[PDB]
From a paper:
Ataxia-telangiectasia mutated (ATM) is a large protein kinase with a central role in the cellular response to DNA double-strand breaks (DSBs) and related genotoxic stress. ATM, which belongs to the phosphatidylinositol 3-kinase-like protein kinase (PIKK) family, is essential for the sensing of DSBs during the cell cycle. MRN contributes to the localization of ATM to DSBs, and together with double-stranded DNA (dsDNA), it activates ATM as a protein kinase.
Cryo-EM samples were prepared by mixing ATM with the non-hydrolyzable ATP analog adenylyl-imidodiphosphate (AMP-PNP) and MgCl2. The cryo-EM data yielded a consensus reconstruction in point group C2 that extended to an overall resolution of 2.5 Å as determined from gold standard Fourier shell correlation (FSC = 0.143). The refined model contains over 90% of the ATM residues, with the remaining residues in poorly-ordered or disordered loops. The ATM FAT domain plays a central role in dimerization, which buries ~3800 Å2 of surface area on each ATM protomer (Krissinel and Henrick, 2007)., the kα9b helix occludes part of the putative substrate-binding site, and the packing of the coiled coil against it may well stabilize this autoinhibitory conformation. The adenine ring is sandwiched between hydrophobic or aromatic residues from the N lobe (Leu2715, Leu2767, and Trp2769) and C lobe (Leu2877 and Ile2889), whereas the N6 and N1 groups hydrogen bond to backbone carbonyl and amide groups of Glu2768 and Cys2770, respectively. The Mg2+ ion, which contacts the AMP-PNP α phosphate group, is coordinated by Asn2875 and Asp2889 of the C lobe – interactions conserved among both PIKKs and canonical protein kinases. In this superposition, the ATM N lobe is positioned remarkably similar to those of inactive mTOR and inactive DNA-PKcs, with the three N lobes forming a tightly clustered set clearly distinct from the cluster of active mTOR and active DNA-PKcs N lobes. The positions of the N lobe hairpin and other ATP-interacting residues relative to the C lobe catalytic and magnesium-coordinating residues are much closer to those of the inactive mTOR and DNA-PKcs structures compared the active ones. This positioning thus suggests that in addition to relieving the blockage of the substrate-binding site, the activation of ATM may well involve a conformational change within the FAT domain and the associated change in the relative orientation of the N and C lobes of the kinase domain. Our cryo-EM structure of human ATM shows an overall symmetric dimer, albeit with the Pincer and Spiral domains exhibiting some mobility arising from conformational flexibility within the Pincer domain.
Numbering used by the authors:
A (entry chain A): 2526 to 2573, 2591 to 2974, 3001 to 3056
B (entry chain A): 1862 to 1876, 1899 to 1974, 1984 to 2112, 2121 to 2392
C (entry chain B): 1995 to 2112, 2121 to 2126
D (entry chain B): 2260 to 2392
E (entry chain A): 1463 to 1728
Amino acid sequence: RMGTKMMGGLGFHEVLNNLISRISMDHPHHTLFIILALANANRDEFLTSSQLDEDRTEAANRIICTIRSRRPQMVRSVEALCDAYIILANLDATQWKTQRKGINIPADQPITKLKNLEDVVVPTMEIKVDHTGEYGNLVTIQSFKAEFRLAGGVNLPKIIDCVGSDGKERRQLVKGRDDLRQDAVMQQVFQMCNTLLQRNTETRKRKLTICTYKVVPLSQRSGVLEWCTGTVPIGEFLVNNEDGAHKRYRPNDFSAFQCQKKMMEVQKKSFEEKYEVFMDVCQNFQPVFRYFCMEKFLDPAIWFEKRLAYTRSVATSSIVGYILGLGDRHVQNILINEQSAELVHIDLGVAFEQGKILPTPETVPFRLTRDIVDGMGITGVEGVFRRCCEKTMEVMRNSQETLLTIVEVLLYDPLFDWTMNPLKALYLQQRPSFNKVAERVLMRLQEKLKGVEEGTVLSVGGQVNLLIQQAIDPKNLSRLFPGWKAWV
Amino acid sequence: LSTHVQGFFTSCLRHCCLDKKSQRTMLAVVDYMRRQKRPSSGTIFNDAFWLDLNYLEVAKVAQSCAAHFTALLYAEIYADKKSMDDQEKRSTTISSLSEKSKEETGISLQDLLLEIYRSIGEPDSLYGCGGGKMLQPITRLRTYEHEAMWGKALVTYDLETAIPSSTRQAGIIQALQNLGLCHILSVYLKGLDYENKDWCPELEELHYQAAWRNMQWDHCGTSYHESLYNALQSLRDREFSTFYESLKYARVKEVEEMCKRSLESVYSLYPTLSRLQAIGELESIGELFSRSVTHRQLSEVYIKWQKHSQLLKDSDFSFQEPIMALRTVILEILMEKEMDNSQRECIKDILTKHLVELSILARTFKNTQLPERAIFQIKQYNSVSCGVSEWQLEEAQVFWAKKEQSLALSILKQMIKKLDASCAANNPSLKLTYTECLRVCGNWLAETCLENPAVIMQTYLEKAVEVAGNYDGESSDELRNGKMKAFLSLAR
Amino acid sequence: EETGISLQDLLLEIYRSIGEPDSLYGCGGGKMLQPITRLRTYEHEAMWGKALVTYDLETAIPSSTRQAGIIQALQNLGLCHILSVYLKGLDYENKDWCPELEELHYQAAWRNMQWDHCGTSYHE
Amino acid sequence: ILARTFKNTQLPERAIFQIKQYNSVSCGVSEWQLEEAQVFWAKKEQSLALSILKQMIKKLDASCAANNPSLKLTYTECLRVCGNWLAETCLENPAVIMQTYLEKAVEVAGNYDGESSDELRNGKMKAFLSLAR
Amino acid sequence: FVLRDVIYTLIHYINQRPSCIMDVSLRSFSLCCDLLSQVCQTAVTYCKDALENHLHVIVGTLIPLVYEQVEVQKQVLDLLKYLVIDNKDNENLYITIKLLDPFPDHVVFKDLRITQQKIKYSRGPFSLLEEINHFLSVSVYDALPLTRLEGLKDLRRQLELHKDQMVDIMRASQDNPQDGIMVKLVVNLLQLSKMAINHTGEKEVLEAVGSCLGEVGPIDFSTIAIQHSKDASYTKALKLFEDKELQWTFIMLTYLNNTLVEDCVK
Ligand SMILES: Nc1ncnc2c1ncn2[C@@H]1O[C@H](COP(=O)(O)OP(=O)(O)NP(=O)(O)O)[C@@H](O)[C@H]1O
Ligand SMILES: [Mg+2]
């Protein structure tokens, strides 16, 4: 909201600038990267629009100068670190697409040169807030490793290792040609939902939380985020062609490739043919996710604890994502922690039921496919999952006012590009007035928080039952995009 | 090896093997073999079948040997193997698998799963395996007790007669106690003793529990509640040696009874920990009762009790209620016993605070009869004065929780009128009560739509803010909290 | 303070005598907190659990009406076995027998088909 | 039924217990089992009522073969009430509710051709109204 | 091996003895005590780290011995003073002196208690978490419940007057409740109580455990399955061997070595 047009004795912009300056000076480690990203919105083309953008850039530059006046060393060194990060992101690295061993970082990159930045806390870490202004004994960046790994994708992000003051490595994912501000905002909402869950006894006793990771956008088209070490994509564990769980445990069933091909063939056909093909595929494709906890945790007590944690994580994530209208929950967008068996949701670009606007609309509130339920045990959705879903929905309903206020603050953020556009819709599904929309989304969220679904008021249990029935309905799953992999 | 091991495991359930040590040895053999990789390339599920085992019988034996997690894992393995075998043969939910297992090996999978989940003690998992014996009265009563549906449990216990008399009477007594009904419970126990001469130990324990909870001091191996009653009676009689002896015996008995269990689930420890904490609190109060009693010692004892209650904020109500009841009995004994120094007012205030805390705790756990009983106990020792007290506000809150809005509003309005007539910005203690009463009355009137917004804002909310702030009784923490709450209500 | 008669109490008694159910809510402001009025409200609304709890709790109520209300609340909730054991304990605890308790005992005896329990009243 | 109408739940349970004292469970179900399911529904115990009604429906389907005129009304009412309860609780998708319960109740009431009755006419009217709704 | 065998043989001789002591029994007892003292002195003099593994059992055996006749009491106190007081400056023995169980509150134990408490508190004052950690670390040494009795009392004091720090402890254990220190302490106390069953002075140990468990009531531990303390050294030793036969050999050798300190001669 920073600007320059209405500065004055009682102007909004001057008061906002003073408040933001005070916040930045009291807590530089929580605000410097944000303000620099605002100031470095168009740094990408520099290294290699509207009046609002220029006003925001000028105000951010003013805040940077004011911060630098009292503490110049940290500002200069953080600027150098951000420049090195953006330069590393802009690296093409198209030749090493086939290599998975670790590519040595070129000596030209400035990230290799910089060592011992005592004034820079690691951006990936979560910095605890102390009310006393002094910050001390914080883990600062010491150096970076000389090797970077390549992650699969259309545009290849880079996995780097940062060695901090304590000498312990932390893996970071550097991305370019993509916007990370949406992910950071969604992480903020996830943190607020976790705080709401913590302060209620019913959900605190069950330890219901949403797994979160730190995202730091460095420009309008680049960023660095926390790499969730010890996690594997659920699709990688399940339907990997070489040593996937489906291939290992059910050799005589359909291969994942066969199911995918059969699903694509029926795409341009009638709905009845889609449903019958989906049923035939599900007949020859049985879930095997229950073997995830069995093969990793041989001790029965640890196995039971990990399975319970997995089920609780699935329930909490499903309810929270339904409240926020999270979409694009395909197998590569969900990771599972190998140590704790808890689910982490990534790629949060699609939310607030924008996925229903897609060419092939998403007909499910969340992902509750056969493998997800099979991972819950012999009882399935009954028992822990349904009760935890009811508890999470009860907490959500009890905090509808605060949640609605937070989403109101989100939706009117000028820099939050949450609405669906044709280019984004086409990129999501490829094959070989704003105020009106915001008000509609807010009213839909209000209806969800009050338990109104189809014009009828439902209890927490009834709403949970309706959501589970919609999520597990084969008719809805048969209509989904093949990339969603509803049969997995 | 497969046929002989299967024969051994079926011998355990024939009911022949009846020695727990041999069953544990063979279960250890199975557990070790489960973790080894077979020479042929395969998965962990294949590694689970070094021998052609029937894992349902092994799971039943493990449950008999109190290996609940192992039994659950073996039941899951058996279900998976049965499904795979059925699919291979053809080239079914839990109920169908249970029917087939019952007609093949004689063990119902659903019943075994329900027993395993009951043994584990995880509350939500009890809803997963429900389809079996839903209509059976025992399962219904267990569900009612788990959900604290004490009225439904009492009705079902009274109705069903095929249940054995001992457990039926135990459930009736528990349901009566959990709903208050102390006089009804005492008369029921008297009638039961009239109708039967034979006395079973569990009914004796329940009778002793009712005797000490209701302060019936003429009711007089030793059990826990008998030991508690004897210790309380000795404390009243100032018999301290036998008091300490009985407390020590009860402590040793509790620990010994805990030692003979499986020690596999954390939920098995909580009742023992609650009993031991109650015994420790009684023992601590014993020393204070022995020597002279002063304001400072009572204050420190109550502060320690409040700290331990804060440590127990996440515990279940079933583990906190006995401690609160024992604290109430201890305080009432302390007040009732010889006090000629006129400093029984300190115990009166301490007991009032304790009963307000108990009412708040019972309200938090959706219980309404216990707060009413606590309010009655408060009114027994207290009266209505010009300077109102916090227990009247607590009573109004209790009546609100009972879905009796008119009564709570009337009580709060009378409280506000009395405070306005009495207080003139002179009593710092009355300030917080006045502000909270005004704020709560305004919030309730807003919620019920019984008053227009203008009157609610003029008379209650801004008035609460003005009382909290313009009185200028600053330099306090509770005042800061009350000011924050009033500001938030007015802002909302 | 002038004539010694409370208008609100008189109105409440008149409306109770008339027996019109809704009119009982018109004059409520008097003696809302009194246990007798609360118990009458609970009985009028068939809140038998609340009536039973309040009857058990409050002791200043005379024993005869307290026991009558307890028995009525127990009967209206079923609880035939509990009611019978309560009556047995009550007879154990007291030798003097008032006529209303005798009528209630006879009512419980015929309702529960206790045929060994044996001016005459209706239930007798 | 009368105690349920007056918002009383303990008396219907006692009456159901008294019924079960003298009666048992047979292949040809009776109306008191449906009444017990209704009582459990009035107790806000929806899972128990649904389980009882589904067991009733399964037993009726296994036993009856459009042969008993008395069982026809019970079967139709059980199917209609189960469909309505499943619709109210949102525990089943509309397609299964319509295929298995509502149209099935209409078919049982009408295609069996056990006409010339008043209770049959009332049951047919209720099933038609439920399907229409 | 000879050192360990001699100490364990003498300890077994001392532990089992007639309640009534005659002249020949007293002479045999004095001979055992003298031989134990001579062996301890020689081993300490010529090998500083010789007693780092056998000090705990020797002290636990000698402690009940002072509640006896004066003649044997003189020898037992002389041996205890030589082991503890006379070798406080010894660097290889100072580590193991810190970890032994506290001595009972008695006038005869005044000097030994003072020395041991200073050796324990030389670094500084102890917090509640530090006290619990020390109590848990002492456990792994000797499987004799009665020897721990005094330590139990000490714990019951701290949990009585450091309840404020228990809130901070539970808060610190919230994120990872599987290895919460309080549930670990409860499980260790219950294991100790199980060990005390069917042993001399079991009621006192049970009462101490009951008091300790009454100090920490039914606190929600946020965990379902009880985990037992497992030896990390054993696990690391197992990681070394890849062959199944080598792991079997290691397990059998560990069992055989652990059985060598048993009273039975066969
Ligand atoms: N925060 C993270 N922690 C761990 N692994 C991650 C994380 N984010 C992404 N990955 C991995 O990197 C892969 C690439 O995913 P992503 O970063 O979303 O790029 P993408 O697949 O192209 N989706 P997008 O870039 O938004 O079009 C994922 O499939 C994961 O295996
Ligand atoms: Mg992706």
